[PDB]
Amino acid sequence: ADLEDNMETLNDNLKVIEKADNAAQVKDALTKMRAAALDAQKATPPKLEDKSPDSPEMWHFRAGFDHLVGHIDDALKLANEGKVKEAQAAAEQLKCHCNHCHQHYR
Amino acid sequence: ADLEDNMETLNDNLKVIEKADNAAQVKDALTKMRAAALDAQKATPPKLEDKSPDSPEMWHFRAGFDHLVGHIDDALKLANEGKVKEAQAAAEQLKCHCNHCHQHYR
Numbered sequence A, B: 001a002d003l004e005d006n007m008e009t010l011n012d013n014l015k016v017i018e019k020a021d022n023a024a025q026v027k028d029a030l031t032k033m034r035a036a037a038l039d040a041q042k043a044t045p046p047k048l049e050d051k052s053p054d055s056p057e058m059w060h061f062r063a064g065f066d067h068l069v070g071h072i073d074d075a076l077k078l079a080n081e082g083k084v085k086e087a088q089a090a091a092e093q094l095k096c097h098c099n100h101c102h103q104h105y106r
């Protein structure tokens, strides 16, 4: 999967989580998002295409995915406890991080 | 302090950070914001007066301050490293988290 494919997985699964009727459904979507975030973290985005792979910008780009994964893991904790509303609310915290990385790098 | 007073501290100190130029000024304003956020987390906002402490809405209200405080800490670390502009950018990014809670509970 390329970066854009991973981003579609992230986008589609936020919607699945919003519509979910139990916490296990939230968990299944979060699990896919975790893999998509880690795959995306290996990519070089177009806006950084000609910069060095070791550049501060590339490390900052990659760091955004670690924080996103931390949010996914915290939502997974709640989902695995059957706490559907809380897990959905924890997943909504992802959106600002979608926005913030996009502001700088999309 | 009252929830509104804590919100005034958060609001006015964002502007202090935006207009500042040095690490000490940014750090001082972020420190005030952090304390105000921790105190705000203890309140019951007017729109949730009809709710119980373990309601999903109160869980979610408290969780937003946990999140905000974590990102204030990230901004403080940048300020402590002397990265004034990066710390100011992190402070501006807090607004998305402010807005997220407001969309539900303000």
Ligand code: HEC
Pocket (backbone or CB within 6 Å): A003, A004, A007, A008, A010, A011, A014, A045, A046, A061, A062, A063, A064, A065, A068, A094, A095, A097, A098, A099, A101, A102, A105, A106
């Ligand atoms: C950086 C750390 C990012 C995070 C976190 C998220 N996204 Fe992203 N996204 C990022 C880049 C660099 C790009 C541009 C890719 C390109 O090839 O131009 C994108 C793009 C998207 C897209 C559009 C995909 C496309 O066809 O270009 C979507 C729909 C998208 N991103 C969604 C999305 C969501 C929902 C996120 C949070 C859950 C999210 N992204 C995080 C970089 C980063």
Ligand code: HEC
Pocket (backbone or CB within 6 Å): B003, B004, B007, B008, B010, B011, B014, B045, B046, B060, B061, B062, B063, B064, B065, B068, B094, B095, B097, B098, B099, B101, B102, B105, B106
């Ligand atoms: C929930 C987790 C919140 C976060 C994070 C932030 N705010 Fe907030 N804010 C919240 C509520 C429930 C309310 C309404 C309080 C009331 O009694 O009506 C507010 C209100 C404000 C206001 C208006 C103050 C007023 O007199 O009503 C401001 C200017 C404000 N909040 C600012 C603000 C900023 C700048 C934040 C991030 C740094 C922020 N808030 C976070 C709930 C929450």
Ligand SMILES: [Ca+2]
Pocket (backbone or CB within 6 Å): A004
């Ligand atoms: Ca493309």
Ligand SMILES: [Ca+2]
Pocket (backbone or CB within 6 Å): A037, A038, A039, A041, A042
């Ligand atoms: Ca990875």
Ligand SMILES: [Ca+2]
Pocket (backbone or CB within 6 Å): A049, A050
């Ligand atoms: Ca090239």
Ligand SMILES: [Ca+2]
Pocket (backbone or CB within 6 Å): B066
């Ligand atoms: Ca916490």
Ligand SMILES: [Ca+2]
Pocket (backbone or CB within 6 Å): none
């Ligand atoms: Ca570091």
Ligand SMILES: [Cu+2]
Pocket (backbone or CB within 6 Å): A067, A071, A093, A097, B067, B071
């Ligand atoms: Cu966060």
